[PDB]
Amino acid sequence: NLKDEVYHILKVLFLFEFDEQGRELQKAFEDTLQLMERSLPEIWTLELFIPPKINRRTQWKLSLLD
Amino acid sequence: GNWKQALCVAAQLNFTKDQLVGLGRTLAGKLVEQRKHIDAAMVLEECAQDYEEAVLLLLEGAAWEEALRLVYKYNRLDIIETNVKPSILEAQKNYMAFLDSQT
Amino acid sequence: RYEKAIGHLSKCGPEYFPECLNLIKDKNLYNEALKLYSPSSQQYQDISIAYGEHLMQEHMYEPAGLMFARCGAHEKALSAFLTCGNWKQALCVAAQLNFTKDQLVGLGRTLAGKLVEQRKHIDAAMVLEECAQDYEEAVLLLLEGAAWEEALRLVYKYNRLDIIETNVKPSILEAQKNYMAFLDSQTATFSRHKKRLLVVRELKEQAQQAPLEDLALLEALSEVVQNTENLKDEVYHILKVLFLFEFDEQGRELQKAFEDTLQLMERSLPEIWTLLDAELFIPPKINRRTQWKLSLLD
């Protein structure tokens, strides 16, 4: 759920020459999402044990920086 | 806390002037207490035309673009570097804090 | 070694800048060029302009407008914001460009037109009210966009009661009838897809004791259930606005039909989804927390 505000904050950050913080936030969110998705099979070994829903559709990344 | 229906029925009661402005500010306070920053800023803008409190609450409401739009509409560029950008930085540092806490 | 090439050519005379920019455009080296020169220099601004033009060449409009906002090409940024439908940053650029109101009232109405093209009636109504102050058109679009209480408040604010009995109530009845049609269609589609899924599954069973349409049927049934679940908020709003206008029959009929659909699919959830693309045989999600029924009527 952090994705929408991450996307908006990245937009407003790079809109105001704050890309130094924007890159840090983008990399940190990348790390969190990647580690959680990697650990997704390991936590819920095949709603308690049911894997949750990750909406990859919702864009969050600021593609201008990359 | 349903501002819209209250305003509808108040209009049907034909209320005129500043007393309704104060009531609208009270309603905006109630909605922002209900974690509705956008709604509070709206009710302030349409009811009191108080654009400074509106942009302040919108800055607090993590919605920045309409805050900048209202700033440029009423020519308040001083808010940009005193409130807008500093609050963006504060929210973004809160976001690194929350990301680290989540990890 | 194109990157090292442009790095070496950077520390040259002023005459070699066109060649450096041509090479940068050839290999799309805008970012490295920006890193090479300080933003306070004119070369950085030219590189930003070229990068924004390339972004428009990628149909990536609003980031191009962002780039032109960084450099200062406010006209092209406004054009990109208009193209991508971003009324918001377009208005920001127009205000910072000190545009005269009459020159921008028509532009705001056109922006509302693009917004209603993008299926955003609330945004269009807000833009019309802010720029054109056309309260009647805002009411019409809010009625179209299912903003019934918003339209009612804006009607009474400008004292336009004629729109109430001529547009508000008839459009509420029309929306209720459309929900009748869509609920019956949802029930029919759910039943048809369930029966086709059962037929395919029984055919597969008879084959197994003695092609992949079942997966598609499961997906379609999941989408039908998801659509009916998403209907909840709109049904709630329409039910409230129907109740407020002394309209019992339509509201209670809608409540009963929605209850029938929801109960049918809730009972049928285990049957269709008997416990590649695991979501096919995973039952969909229902949001029972959402409130749609009128405790007023019952």
Swiss-Prot record, chain B:
Homodimer; dimerization promotes ELP1 stability and elongator complex formation. Component of the elongator complex which consists of ELP1, ELP2, ELP3, ELP4, ELP5 and ELP6. Interacts preferentially with MAP3K14/NIK followed by IKK-alpha and IKK-beta. It is found in: Cytoplasm; Nucleus. The gene is ELP1. Belongs to the ELP1/IKA1 family. Component of the elongator complex which is required for multiple tRNA modifications, including mcm5U (5-methoxycarbonylmethyl uridine), mcm5s2U (5-methoxycarbonylmethyl-2-thiouridine), and ncm5U (5-carbamoylmethyl uridine). The elongator complex catalyzes the formation of carboxymethyluridine in the wobble base at position 34 in tRNAs. Regulates the migration and branching of projection neurons in the developing cerebral cortex, through a process depending on alpha-tubulin acetylation. ELP1 binds to tRNA, mediating interaction of the elongator complex with tRNA. It comes from Homo sapiens (Human). It is linked to Neuropathy, hereditary sensory and autonomic, 3: A form of hereditary sensory and autonomic neuropathy, a genetically and clinically heterogeneous group of disorders characterized by degeneration of dorsal root and autonomic ganglion cells, and by sensory and/or autonomic abnormalities. HSAN3 patients manifest a variety of symptoms such as alacrima, decreased taste, decreased sensitivity to pain and temperature, vasomotor instability, hypoactive or absent deep tendon reflexes, vomiting crises, and gastrointestinal dysfunction. Medulloblastoma: Malignant, invasive embryonal tumor of the cerebellum with a preferential manifestation in children. It comes from the Eukaryota. This is Elongator complex protein 1.
